[PDB]
Amino acid sequence: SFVGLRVVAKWSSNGYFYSGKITRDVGAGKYKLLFDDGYECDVLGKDILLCDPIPLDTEVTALSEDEYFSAGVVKGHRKESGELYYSIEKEGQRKWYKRMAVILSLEQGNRLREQYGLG
Amino acid sequence: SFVGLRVVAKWSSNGYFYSGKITRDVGAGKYKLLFDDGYECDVLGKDILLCDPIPLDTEVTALSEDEYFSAGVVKGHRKESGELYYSIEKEGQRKWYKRMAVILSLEQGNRLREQYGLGPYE
Ligand SMILES: CCCC(=O)c1ccc(N2CCN(CC)CC2)c(F)c1
Ligand SMILES: CCCC(=O)c1ccc(N2CCN(CC)CC2)c(F)c1
């Protein structure tokens, strides 16, 4: 099944896609998610990307203390104490971001559906 | 030490206060905060509430697929497998929320500063 797999899944409240894992196959195209931000809810399979890690050169939306969710490009990956960080380039400068600080806008997630969508 | 203590701290980027733990004294009256949502950053001690659990009868803000950042009042606490859940009352009805799903609006957190503030300058 898809239970236990890492995904980037749309939260329909605002349309962005967020990293997490599928915890249950509910049936009829519905899955239960545990997002990395701790949120738990059901998400439809058509809005789940089976994409992990987010690939190098993907356009993403990333949070830091100086940037409230602005666009950047993935230029690296690092695991430290089992946790994934992304190196994201914005206006020619790079910083490391925790997995939960890297999301996809609706347009950015849509770009990945054909290749990575469940479905 | 404050390292390891559970707190509820204002995040200046959007004004709400969120649950987490102090992980480091970074000096300058600031502490590193690992929020329960997984985010890490430095926060002024003056903006940290030493408040755990969030007390009964506190007005809070809850998030679920049925409650969109809605105001409610803490009417219960439950610990199961070491995890804390809150029972929040709104319009006479109560639902259980996990810890990350209960936050404080700017006003809701501001209310608690005098009583629960870390108080780095006392
Ligand atoms: C109005 C309160 C502050 C605010 O703007 C806000 C808080 C939490 C949010 N969530 C991220 C997605 N996650 C689910 C993956 C749930 C929590 C969010 F989208 C916005
Ligand atoms: C751009 C869409 C909005 C959104 O996805 C979002 C995600 C995480 C947020 N934060 C909540 C507080 N947390 C602890 C301080 C940091 C993360 C938030 F306020 C909003």
Side-chain angles (χ1 to χ4, degrees), chain A residues 11-13 34 36-41 63-65 68 85 98 100-101, chain B residues 11-14 34 36-42 63-65 68-69 98 100:
Chain A
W11 186 40
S12 61
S13 182
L34 177 54
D36 293 314
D37 78 357
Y39 197 67
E40 289 173 38
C41 72
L63 173 69
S64 71
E65 294 297 284
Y68 198 80
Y85 295 71
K98 281 198 144 56
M100 66 70 57
Chain B
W11 192 43
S12 67
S13 289
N14 66 24
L34 173 60
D36 293 310
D37 77 0
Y39 189 69
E40 289 190 37
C41 66
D42 297 342
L63 180 66
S64 71
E65 294 300 274
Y68 184 64
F69 303 110
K98 74 190 294 186
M100 67 78 57

PDB file of all heavy atoms in Angstrom, chain A residues 11-13 34 36-41 63-65 68 85 98 100-101, chain B residues 11-14 34 36-42 63-65 68-69 98 100:
ATOM      1  N   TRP A  11      -3.243  20.669   1.130  1.00  0.00           N
ATOM      2  CA  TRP A  11      -4.198  20.952   2.162  1.00  0.00           C
ATOM      3  C   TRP A  11      -5.199  21.893   1.527  1.00  0.00           C
ATOM      4  O   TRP A  11      -4.878  23.026   1.192  1.00  0.00           O
ATOM      5  CB  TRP A  11      -3.551  21.571   3.374  1.00  0.00           C
ATOM      6  CG  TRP A  11      -4.490  21.737   4.523  1.00  0.00           C
ATOM      7  CD1 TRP A  11      -5.452  20.864   4.943  1.00  0.00           C
ATOM      8  CD2 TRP A  11      -4.552  22.854   5.402  1.00  0.00           C
ATOM      9  NE1 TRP A  11      -6.108  21.373   6.035  1.00  0.00           N
ATOM     10  CE2 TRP A  11      -5.572  22.594   6.337  1.00  0.00           C
ATOM     11  CE3 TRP A  11      -3.858  24.052   5.483  1.00  0.00           C
ATOM     12  CZ2 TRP A  11      -5.883  23.492   7.356  1.00  0.00           C
ATOM     13  CZ3 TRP A  11      -4.165  24.937   6.512  1.00  0.00           C
ATOM     14  CH2 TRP A  11      -5.173  24.651   7.408  1.00  0.00           C
ATOM     15  N   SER A  12      -6.417  21.409   1.319  1.00  0.00           N
ATOM     16  CA  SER A  12      -7.354  22.146   0.496  1.00  0.00           C
ATOM     17  C   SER A  12      -7.766  23.479   1.094  1.00  0.00           C
ATOM     18  O   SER A  12      -8.224  24.320   0.355  1.00  0.00           O
ATOM     19  CB  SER A  12      -8.594  21.313   0.202  1.00  0.00           C
ATOM     20  OG  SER A  12      -9.245  20.997   1.389  1.00  0.00           O
ATOM     21  N   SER A  13      -7.594  23.662   2.400  1.00  0.00           N
ATOM     22  CA  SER A  13      -7.952  24.945   3.048  1.00  0.00           C
ATOM     23  C   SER A  13      -7.309  26.116   2.336  1.00  0.00           C
ATOM     24  O   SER A  13      -7.956  27.150   2.113  1.00  0.00           O
ATOM     25  CB  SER A  13      -7.551  24.949   4.511  1.00  0.00           C
ATOM     26  OG  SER A  13      -7.951  26.172   5.150  1.00  0.00           O
ATOM     27  N   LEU A  34      -0.472  12.321   8.272  1.00  0.00           N
ATOM     28  CA  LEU A  34       0.209  12.997   9.350  1.00  0.00           C
ATOM     29  C   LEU A  34       1.233  13.880   8.683  1.00  0.00           C
ATOM     30  O   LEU A  34       2.227  13.415   8.121  1.00  0.00           O
ATOM     31  CB  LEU A  34       0.865  12.013  10.313  1.00  0.00           C
ATOM     32  CG  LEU A  34       1.685  12.583  11.467  1.00  0.00           C
ATOM     33  CD1 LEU A  34       0.901  13.589  12.290  1.00  0.00           C
ATOM     34  CD2 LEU A  34       2.177  11.473  12.374  1.00  0.00           C
ATOM     35  N   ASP A  36       4.186  16.694   8.502  1.00  0.00           N
ATOM     36  CA  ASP A  36       5.384  16.985   9.300  1.00  0.00           C
ATOM     37  C   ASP A  36       5.208  18.148  10.263  1.00  0.00           C
ATOM     38  O   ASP A  36       5.880  18.205  11.281  1.00  0.00           O
ATOM     39  CB  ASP A  36       6.599  17.191   8.400  1.00  0.00           C
ATOM     40  CG  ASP A  36       6.999  15.915   7.685  1.00  0.00           C
ATOM     41  OD1 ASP A  36       7.062  14.870   8.352  1.00  0.00           O
ATOM     42  OD2 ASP A  36       7.151  15.974   6.468  1.00  0.00           O
ATOM     43  N   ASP A  37       4.254  19.033   9.984  1.00  0.00           N
ATOM     44  CA  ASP A  37       3.921  20.081  10.944  1.00  0.00           C
ATOM     45  C   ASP A  37       3.010  19.589  12.067  1.00  0.00           C
ATOM     46  O   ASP A  37       2.654  20.364  12.951  1.00  0.00           O
ATOM     47  CB  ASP A  37       3.404  21.361  10.253  1.00  0.00           C
ATOM     48  CG  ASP A  37       1.951  21.290   9.784  1.00  0.00           C
ATOM     49  OD1 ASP A  37       1.279  20.253   9.901  1.00  0.00           O
ATOM     50  OD2 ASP A  37       1.520  22.350   9.252  1.00  0.00           O
ATOM     51  N   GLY A  38       2.683  18.292  12.067  1.00  0.00           N
ATOM     52  CA  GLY A  38       1.915  17.649  13.119  1.00  0.00           C
ATOM     53  C   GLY A  38       0.427  17.565  12.832  1.00  0.00           C
ATOM     54  O   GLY A  38      -0.267  16.846  13.521  1.00  0.00           O
ATOM     55  N   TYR A  39      -0.051  18.253  11.798  1.00  0.00           N
ATOM     56  CA  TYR A  39      -1.484  18.250  11.509  1.00  0.00           C
ATOM     57  C   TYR A  39      -1.934  16.888  10.994  1.00  0.00           C
ATOM     58  O   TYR A  39      -1.199  16.203  10.271  1.00  0.00           O
ATOM     59  CB  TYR A  39      -1.811  19.344  10.514  1.00  0.00           C
ATOM     60  CG  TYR A  39      -3.279  19.719  10.420  1.00  0.00           C
ATOM     61  CD1 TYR A  39      -3.921  20.329  11.493  1.00  0.00           C
ATOM     62  CD2 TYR A  39      -3.999  19.498   9.250  1.00  0.00           C
ATOM     63  CE1 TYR A  39      -5.258  20.693  11.416  1.00  0.00           C
ATOM     64  CE2 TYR A  39      -5.334  19.864   9.154  1.00  0.00           C
ATOM     65  CZ  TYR A  39      -5.945  20.455  10.240  1.00  0.00           C
ATOM     66  OH  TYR A  39      -7.268  20.833  10.152  1.00  0.00           O
ATOM     67  N   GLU A  40      -3.136  16.481  11.415  1.00  0.00           N
ATOM     68  CA  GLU A  40      -3.722  15.232  10.974  1.00  0.00           C
ATOM     69  C   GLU A  40      -5.039  15.498  10.297  1.00  0.00           C
ATOM     70  O   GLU A  40      -5.914  16.109  10.900  1.00  0.00           O
ATOM     71  CB  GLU A  40      -3.947  14.311  12.179  1.00  0.00           C
ATOM     72  CG  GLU A  40      -2.663  13.777  12.756  1.00  0.00           C
ATOM     73  CD  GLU A  40      -2.851  13.004  14.054  1.00  0.00           C
ATOM     74  OE1 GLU A  40      -3.852  12.263  14.192  1.00  0.00           O
ATOM     75  OE2 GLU A  40      -1.984  13.139  14.938  1.00  0.00           O
ATOM     76  N   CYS A  41      -5.181  15.040   9.054  1.00  0.00           N
ATOM     77  CA  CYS A  41      -6.473  15.089   8.368  1.00  0.00           C
ATOM     78  C   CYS A  41      -6.503  14.180   7.160  1.00  0.00           C
ATOM     79  O   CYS A  41      -5.481  13.616   6.768  1.00  0.00           O
ATOM     80  CB  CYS A  41      -6.839  16.510   7.962  1.00  0.00           C
ATOM     81  SG  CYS A  41      -5.881  17.202   6.617  1.00  0.00           S
ATOM     82  N   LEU A  63      10.043  29.018   4.107  1.00  0.00           N
ATOM     83  CA  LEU A  63       9.887  29.915   5.247  1.00  0.00           C
ATOM     84  C   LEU A  63      11.189  30.077   6.003  1.00  0.00           C
ATOM     85  O   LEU A  63      11.826  29.075   6.359  1.00  0.00           O
ATOM     86  CB  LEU A  63       8.861  29.332   6.211  1.00  0.00           C
ATOM     87  CG  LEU A  63       8.664  30.049   7.559  1.00  0.00           C
ATOM     88  CD1 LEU A  63       8.008  31.414   7.439  1.00  0.00           C
ATOM     89  CD2 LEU A  63       7.823  29.178   8.457  1.00  0.00           C
ATOM     90  N   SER A  64      11.537  31.327   6.299  1.00  0.00           N
ATOM     91  CA  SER A  64      12.560  31.659   7.284  1.00  0.00           C
ATOM     92  C   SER A  64      12.099  32.860   8.086  1.00  0.00           C
ATOM     93  O   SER A  64      11.034  33.385   7.821  1.00  0.00           O
ATOM     94  CB  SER A  64      13.909  31.966   6.629  1.00  0.00           C
ATOM     95  OG  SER A  64      13.871  33.189   5.943  1.00  0.00           O
ATOM     96  N   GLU A  65      12.892  33.289   9.052  1.00  0.00           N
ATOM     97  CA  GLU A  65      12.527  34.486   9.836  1.00  0.00           C
ATOM     98  C   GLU A  65      12.483  35.764   9.014  1.00  0.00           C
ATOM     99  O   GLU A  65      11.743  36.687   9.372  1.00  0.00           O
ATOM    100  CB  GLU A  65      13.432  34.651  11.041  1.00  0.00           C
ATOM    101  CG  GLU A  65      13.288  33.552  12.097  1.00  0.00           C
ATOM    102  CD  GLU A  65      11.917  33.529  12.699  1.00  0.00           C
ATOM    103  OE1 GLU A  65      11.624  34.412  13.542  1.00  0.00           O
ATOM    104  OE2 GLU A  65      11.077  32.725  12.244  1.00  0.00           O
ATOM    105  N   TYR A  68       8.575  35.311   4.676  1.00  0.00           N
ATOM    106  CA  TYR A  68       7.320  34.619   4.970  1.00  0.00           C
ATOM    107  C   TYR A  68       6.825  33.879   3.738  1.00  0.00           C
ATOM    108  O   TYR A  68       5.988  34.385   2.965  1.00  0.00           O
ATOM    109  CB  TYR A  68       6.257  35.605   5.438  1.00  0.00           C
ATOM    110  CG  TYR A  68       5.121  34.925   6.140  1.00  0.00           C
ATOM    111  CD1 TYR A  68       5.253  34.542   7.465  1.00  0.00           C
ATOM    112  CD2 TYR A  68       3.920  34.684   5.498  1.00  0.00           C
ATOM    113  CE1 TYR A  68       4.221  33.934   8.154  1.00  0.00           C
ATOM    114  CE2 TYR A  68       2.878  34.057   6.169  1.00  0.00           C
ATOM    115  CZ  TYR A  68       3.040  33.689   7.505  1.00  0.00           C
ATOM    116  OH  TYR A  68       2.019  33.105   8.217  1.00  0.00           O
ATOM    117  N   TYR A  85      17.014  18.390   5.734  1.00  0.00           N
ATOM    118  CA  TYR A  85      17.028  19.809   5.412  1.00  0.00           C
ATOM    119  C   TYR A  85      17.242  20.020   3.917  1.00  0.00           C
ATOM    120  O   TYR A  85      17.916  19.200   3.261  1.00  0.00           O
ATOM    121  CB  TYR A  85      18.143  20.520   6.157  1.00  0.00           C
ATOM    122  CG  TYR A  85      17.973  20.534   7.647  1.00  0.00           C
ATOM    123  CD1 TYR A  85      18.134  19.363   8.385  1.00  0.00           C
ATOM    124  CD2 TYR A  85      17.696  21.719   8.319  1.00  0.00           C
ATOM    125  CE1 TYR A  85      18.007  19.357   9.758  1.00  0.00           C
ATOM    126  CE2 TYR A  85      17.563  21.720   9.707  1.00  0.00           C
ATOM    127  CZ  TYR A  85      17.711  20.530  10.404  1.00  0.00           C
ATOM    128  OH  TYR A  85      17.588  20.484  11.782  1.00  0.00           O
ATOM    129  N   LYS A  98      14.520  23.484   7.307  1.00  0.00           N
ATOM    130  CA  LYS A  98      13.942  22.239   7.760  1.00  0.00           C
ATOM    131  C   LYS A  98      12.886  21.765   6.784  1.00  0.00           C
ATOM    132  O   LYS A  98      12.245  22.564   6.128  1.00  0.00           O
ATOM    133  CB  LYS A  98      13.283  22.418   9.112  1.00  0.00           C
ATOM    134  CG  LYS A  98      14.230  22.427  10.277  1.00  0.00           C
ATOM    135  CD  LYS A  98      13.487  22.171  11.594  1.00  0.00           C
ATOM    136  CE  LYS A  98      14.316  21.342  12.550  1.00  0.00           C
ATOM    137  NZ  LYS A  98      15.638  21.961  12.812  1.00  0.00           N
ATOM    138  N   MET A 100       9.874  20.852   7.156  1.00  0.00           N
ATOM    139  CA  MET A 100       8.529  21.416   7.335  1.00  0.00           C
ATOM    140  C   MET A 100       8.442  22.883   6.887  1.00  0.00           C
ATOM    141  O   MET A 100       7.328  23.415   6.758  1.00  0.00           O
ATOM    142  CB  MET A 100       8.031  21.232   8.780  1.00  0.00           C
ATOM    143  CG  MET A 100       8.782  21.982   9.866  1.00  0.00           C
ATOM    144  SD  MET A 100       8.562  23.759   9.878  1.00  0.00           S
ATOM    145  CE  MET A 100       6.809  23.992  10.022  1.00  0.00           C
ATOM    146  N   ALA A 101       9.594  23.545   6.675  1.00  0.00           N
ATOM    147  CA  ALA A 101       9.609  24.930   6.203  1.00  0.00           C
ATOM    148  C   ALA A 101       9.618  25.035   4.689  1.00  0.00           C
ATOM    149  O   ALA A 101       9.688  26.150   4.160  1.00  0.00           O
ATOM    150  CB  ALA A 101      10.775  25.700   6.792  1.00  0.00           C
TER     151      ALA A 101
ATOM    152  N   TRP B  11       5.339  34.206  17.868  1.00  0.00           N
ATOM    153  CA  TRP B  11       6.103  34.234  16.644  1.00  0.00           C
ATOM    154  C   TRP B  11       5.840  35.550  15.948  1.00  0.00           C
ATOM    155  O   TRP B  11       4.744  35.780  15.418  1.00  0.00           O
ATOM    156  CB  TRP B  11       5.678  33.074  15.773  1.00  0.00           C
ATOM    157  CG  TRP B  11       6.608  32.858  14.605  1.00  0.00           C
ATOM    158  CD1 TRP B  11       7.973  32.899  14.610  1.00  0.00           C
ATOM    159  CD2 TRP B  11       6.212  32.538  13.267  1.00  0.00           C
ATOM    160  NE1 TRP B  11       8.449  32.622  13.349  1.00  0.00           N
ATOM    161  CE2 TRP B  11       7.393  32.389  12.509  1.00  0.00           C
ATOM    162  CE3 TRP B  11       4.961  32.341  12.642  1.00  0.00           C
ATOM    163  CZ2 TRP B  11       7.361  32.071  11.151  1.00  0.00           C
ATOM    164  CZ3 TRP B  11       4.926  32.014  11.306  1.00  0.00           C
ATOM    165  CH2 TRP B  11       6.137  31.885  10.566  1.00  0.00           C
ATOM    166  N   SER B  12       6.858  36.389  15.933  1.00  0.00           N
ATOM    167  CA  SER B  12       6.703  37.773  15.411  1.00  0.00           C
ATOM    168  C   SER B  12       6.245  37.849  13.958  1.00  0.00           C
ATOM    169  O   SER B  12       5.643  38.858  13.560  1.00  0.00           O
ATOM    170  CB  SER B  12       7.970  38.582  15.598  1.00  0.00           C
ATOM    171  OG  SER B  12       9.032  38.085  14.799  1.00  0.00           O
ATOM    172  N   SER B  13       6.481  36.794  13.175  1.00  0.00           N
ATOM    173  CA  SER B  13       6.071  36.842  11.780  1.00  0.00           C
ATOM    174  C   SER B  13       4.581  36.934  11.544  1.00  0.00           C
ATOM    175  O   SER B  13       4.171  37.498  10.526  1.00  0.00           O
ATOM    176  CB  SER B  13       6.597  35.640  11.013  1.00  0.00           C
ATOM    177  OG  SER B  13       7.992  35.744  10.831  1.00  0.00           O
ATOM    178  N   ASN B  14       3.761  36.370  12.413  1.00  0.00           N
ATOM    179  CA  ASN B  14       2.311  36.550  12.256  1.00  0.00           C
ATOM    180  C   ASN B  14       1.536  36.891  13.513  1.00  0.00           C
ATOM    181  O   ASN B  14       0.316  37.074  13.456  1.00  0.00           O
ATOM    182  CB  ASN B  14       1.650  35.397  11.467  1.00  0.00           C
ATOM    183  CG  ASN B  14       1.673  34.047  12.161  1.00  0.00           C
ATOM    184  OD1 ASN B  14       1.767  33.943  13.387  1.00  0.00           O
ATOM    185  ND2 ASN B  14       1.566  32.993  11.343  1.00  0.00           N
ATOM    186  N   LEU B  34      12.067  25.117  19.677  1.00  0.00           N
ATOM    187  CA  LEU B  34      11.616  24.088  18.759  1.00  0.00           C
ATOM    188  C   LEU B  34      10.099  23.991  18.973  1.00  0.00           C
ATOM    189  O   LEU B  34       9.618  23.470  20.007  1.00  0.00           O
ATOM    190  CB  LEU B  34      12.314  22.751  18.994  1.00  0.00           C
ATOM    191  CG  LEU B  34      11.764  21.569  18.175  1.00  0.00           C
ATOM    192  CD1 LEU B  34      11.867  21.796  16.684  1.00  0.00           C
ATOM    193  CD2 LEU B  34      12.517  20.305  18.529  1.00  0.00           C
ATOM    194  N   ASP B  36       6.234  22.742  18.387  1.00  0.00           N
ATOM    195  CA  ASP B  36       5.621  21.449  18.164  1.00  0.00           C
ATOM    196  C   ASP B  36       5.281  21.187  16.709  1.00  0.00           C
ATOM    197  O   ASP B  36       5.219  20.019  16.306  1.00  0.00           O
ATOM    198  CB  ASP B  36       4.402  21.275  19.067  1.00  0.00           C
ATOM    199  CG  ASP B  36       4.810  21.186  20.528  1.00  0.00           C
ATOM    200  OD1 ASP B  36       5.724  20.372  20.826  1.00  0.00           O
ATOM    201  OD2 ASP B  36       4.245  21.871  21.369  1.00  0.00           O
ATOM    202  N   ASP B  37       5.118  22.242  15.911  1.00  0.00           N
ATOM    203  CA  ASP B  37       4.949  22.084  14.479  1.00  0.00           C
ATOM    204  C   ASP B  37       6.255  21.797  13.742  1.00  0.00           C
ATOM    205  O   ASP B  37       6.247  21.649  12.518  1.00  0.00           O
ATOM    206  CB  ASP B  37       4.141  23.235  13.869  1.00  0.00           C
ATOM    207  CG  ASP B  37       4.924  24.527  13.684  1.00  0.00           C
ATOM    208  OD1 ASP B  37       6.128  24.628  14.015  1.00  0.00           O
ATOM    209  OD2 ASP B  37       4.237  25.449  13.177  1.00  0.00           O
ATOM    210  N   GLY B  38       7.375  21.718  14.469  1.00  0.00           N
ATOM    211  CA  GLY B  38       8.661  21.366  13.917  1.00  0.00           C
ATOM    212  C   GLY B  38       9.575  22.523  13.547  1.00  0.00           C
ATOM    213  O   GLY B  38      10.762  22.304  13.322  1.00  0.00           O
ATOM    214  N   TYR B  39       9.027  23.750  13.557  1.00  0.00           N
ATOM    215  CA  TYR B  39       9.808  24.944  13.186  1.00  0.00           C
ATOM    216  C   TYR B  39      10.740  25.287  14.327  1.00  0.00           C
ATOM    217  O   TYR B  39      10.366  25.113  15.496  1.00  0.00           O
ATOM    218  CB  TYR B  39       8.885  26.130  12.871  1.00  0.00           C
ATOM    219  CG  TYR B  39       9.591  27.333  12.287  1.00  0.00           C
ATOM    220  CD1 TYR B  39      10.130  27.292  11.010  1.00  0.00           C
ATOM    221  CD2 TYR B  39       9.692  28.537  13.011  1.00  0.00           C
ATOM    222  CE1 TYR B  39      10.765  28.388  10.470  1.00  0.00           C
ATOM    223  CE2 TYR B  39      10.310  29.645  12.477  1.00  0.00           C
ATOM    224  CZ  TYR B  39      10.846  29.565  11.205  1.00  0.00           C
ATOM    225  OH  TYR B  39      11.488  30.654  10.661  1.00  0.00           O
ATOM    226  N   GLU B  40      11.930  25.784  13.988  1.00  0.00           N
ATOM    227  CA  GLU B  40      12.922  26.233  14.956  1.00  0.00           C
ATOM    228  C   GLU B  40      13.336  27.660  14.650  1.00  0.00           C
ATOM    229  O   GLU B  40      13.621  27.995  13.496  1.00  0.00           O
ATOM    230  CB  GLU B  40      14.178  25.365  14.900  1.00  0.00           C
ATOM    231  CG  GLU B  40      14.005  23.976  15.450  1.00  0.00           C
ATOM    232  CD  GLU B  40      15.333  23.252  15.599  1.00  0.00           C
ATOM    233  OE1 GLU B  40      16.356  23.897  15.964  1.00  0.00           O
ATOM    234  OE2 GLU B  40      15.367  22.035  15.307  1.00  0.00           O
ATOM    235  N   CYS B  41      13.338  28.504  15.679  1.00  0.00           N
ATOM    236  CA  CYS B  41      13.909  29.845  15.586  1.00  0.00           C
ATOM    237  C   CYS B  41      14.157  30.418  16.982  1.00  0.00           C
ATOM    238  O   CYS B  41      13.760  29.849  17.980  1.00  0.00           O
ATOM    239  CB  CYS B  41      12.993  30.759  14.776  1.00  0.00           C
ATOM    240  SG  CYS B  41      11.402  31.101  15.542  1.00  0.00           S
ATOM    241  N   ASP B  42      14.841  31.546  17.014  1.00  0.00           N
ATOM    242  CA  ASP B  42      15.119  32.271  18.223  1.00  0.00           C
ATOM    243  C   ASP B  42      13.998  33.264  18.526  1.00  0.00           C
ATOM    244  O   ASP B  42      13.499  33.931  17.620  1.00  0.00           O
ATOM    245  CB  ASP B  42      16.459  32.994  18.130  1.00  0.00           C
ATOM    246  CG  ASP B  42      17.646  32.057  17.974  1.00  0.00           C
ATOM    247  OD1 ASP B  42      17.539  30.852  18.270  1.00  0.00           O
ATOM    248  OD2 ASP B  42      18.714  32.575  17.562  1.00  0.00           O
ATOM    249  N   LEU B  63      -7.632  24.692  15.531  1.00  0.00           N
ATOM    250  CA  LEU B  63      -7.671  24.343  14.111  1.00  0.00           C
ATOM    251  C   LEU B  63      -7.997  22.870  13.916  1.00  0.00           C
ATOM    252  O   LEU B  63      -7.332  21.988  14.459  1.00  0.00           O
ATOM    253  CB  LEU B  63      -6.342  24.644  13.430  1.00  0.00           C
ATOM    254  CG  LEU B  63      -6.316  24.298  11.920  1.00  0.00           C
ATOM    255  CD1 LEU B  63      -7.260  25.192  11.122  1.00  0.00           C
ATOM    256  CD2 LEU B  63      -4.914  24.412  11.376  1.00  0.00           C
ATOM    257  N   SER B  64      -9.024  22.624  13.119  1.00  0.00           N
ATOM    258  CA  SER B  64      -9.335  21.285  12.613  1.00  0.00           C
ATOM    259  C   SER B  64     -10.017  21.492  11.279  1.00  0.00           C
ATOM    260  O   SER B  64     -10.214  22.625  10.847  1.00  0.00           O
ATOM    261  CB  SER B  64     -10.253  20.545  13.572  1.00  0.00           C
ATOM    262  OG  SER B  64     -11.562  21.100  13.541  1.00  0.00           O
ATOM    263  N   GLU B  65     -10.375  20.396  10.626  1.00  0.00           N
ATOM    264  CA  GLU B  65     -11.083  20.505   9.351  1.00  0.00           C
ATOM    265  C   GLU B  65     -12.496  21.071   9.526  1.00  0.00           C
ATOM    266  O   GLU B  65     -13.075  21.528   8.540  1.00  0.00           O
ATOM    267  CB  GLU B  65     -11.100  19.165   8.613  1.00  0.00           C
ATOM    268  CG  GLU B  65      -9.715  18.681   8.153  1.00  0.00           C
ATOM    269  CD  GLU B  65      -9.014  19.636   7.208  1.00  0.00           C
ATOM    270  OE1 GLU B  65      -9.245  19.567   5.971  1.00  0.00           O
ATOM    271  OE2 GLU B  65      -8.227  20.482   7.658  1.00  0.00           O
ATOM    272  N   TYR B  68     -12.097  26.560  11.841  1.00  0.00           N
ATOM    273  CA  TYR B  68     -11.114  27.332  11.114  1.00  0.00           C
ATOM    274  C   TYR B  68     -10.523  28.429  11.975  1.00  0.00           C
ATOM    275  O   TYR B  68     -10.991  29.573  11.963  1.00  0.00           O
ATOM    276  CB  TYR B  68     -11.749  27.897   9.853  1.00  0.00           C
ATOM    277  CG  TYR B  68     -10.771  28.636   8.993  1.00  0.00           C
ATOM    278  CD1 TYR B  68      -9.696  27.968   8.408  1.00  0.00           C
ATOM    279  CD2 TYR B  68     -10.907  29.996   8.744  1.00  0.00           C
ATOM    280  CE1 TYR B  68      -8.780  28.649   7.606  1.00  0.00           C
ATOM    281  CE2 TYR B  68     -10.004  30.688   7.934  1.00  0.00           C
ATOM    282  CZ  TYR B  68      -8.935  30.013   7.367  1.00  0.00           C
ATOM    283  OH  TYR B  68      -8.071  30.712   6.584  1.00  0.00           O
ATOM    284  N   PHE B  69      -9.490  28.101  12.753  1.00  0.00           N
ATOM    285  CA  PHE B  69      -8.848  29.072  13.636  1.00  0.00           C
ATOM    286  C   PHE B  69      -9.902  29.800  14.486  1.00  0.00           C
ATOM    287  O   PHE B  69      -9.933  31.033  14.579  1.00  0.00           O
ATOM    288  CB  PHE B  69      -7.970  30.045  12.848  1.00  0.00           C
ATOM    289  CG  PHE B  69      -6.900  29.376  12.032  1.00  0.00           C
ATOM    290  CD1 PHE B  69      -6.972  29.356  10.652  1.00  0.00           C
ATOM    291  CD2 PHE B  69      -5.800  28.797  12.646  1.00  0.00           C
ATOM    292  CE1 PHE B  69      -5.981  28.747   9.895  1.00  0.00           C
ATOM    293  CE2 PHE B  69      -4.806  28.181  11.909  1.00  0.00           C
ATOM    294  CZ  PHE B  69      -4.878  28.179  10.533  1.00  0.00           C
ATOM    295  N   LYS B  98      -5.033  17.908  19.372  1.00  0.00           N
ATOM    296  CA  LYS B  98      -3.661  17.695  19.727  1.00  0.00           C
ATOM    297  C   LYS B  98      -2.970  19.051  19.976  1.00  0.00           C
ATOM    298  O   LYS B  98      -3.457  20.139  19.622  1.00  0.00           O
ATOM    299  CB  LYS B  98      -2.918  16.860  18.674  1.00  0.00           C
ATOM    300  CG  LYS B  98      -2.579  17.591  17.385  1.00  0.00           C
ATOM    301  CD  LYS B  98      -2.066  16.639  16.302  1.00  0.00           C
ATOM    302  CE  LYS B  98      -0.722  16.017  16.671  1.00  0.00           C
ATOM    303  NZ  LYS B  98      -0.128  15.185  15.582  1.00  0.00           N
ATOM    304  N   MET B 100      -0.370  20.856  18.829  1.00  0.00           N
ATOM    305  CA  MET B 100      -0.011  21.791  17.742  1.00  0.00           C
ATOM    306  C   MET B 100      -1.226  22.475  17.125  1.00  0.00           C
ATOM    307  O   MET B 100      -1.087  23.438  16.393  1.00  0.00           O
ATOM    308  CB  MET B 100       0.799  21.117  16.603  1.00  0.00           C
ATOM    309  CG  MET B 100       0.041  20.060  15.749  1.00  0.00           C
ATOM    310  SD  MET B 100      -1.104  20.744  14.476  1.00  0.00           S
ATOM    311  CE  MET B 100      -0.034  21.793  13.473  1.00  0.00           C
TER     312      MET B 100
END
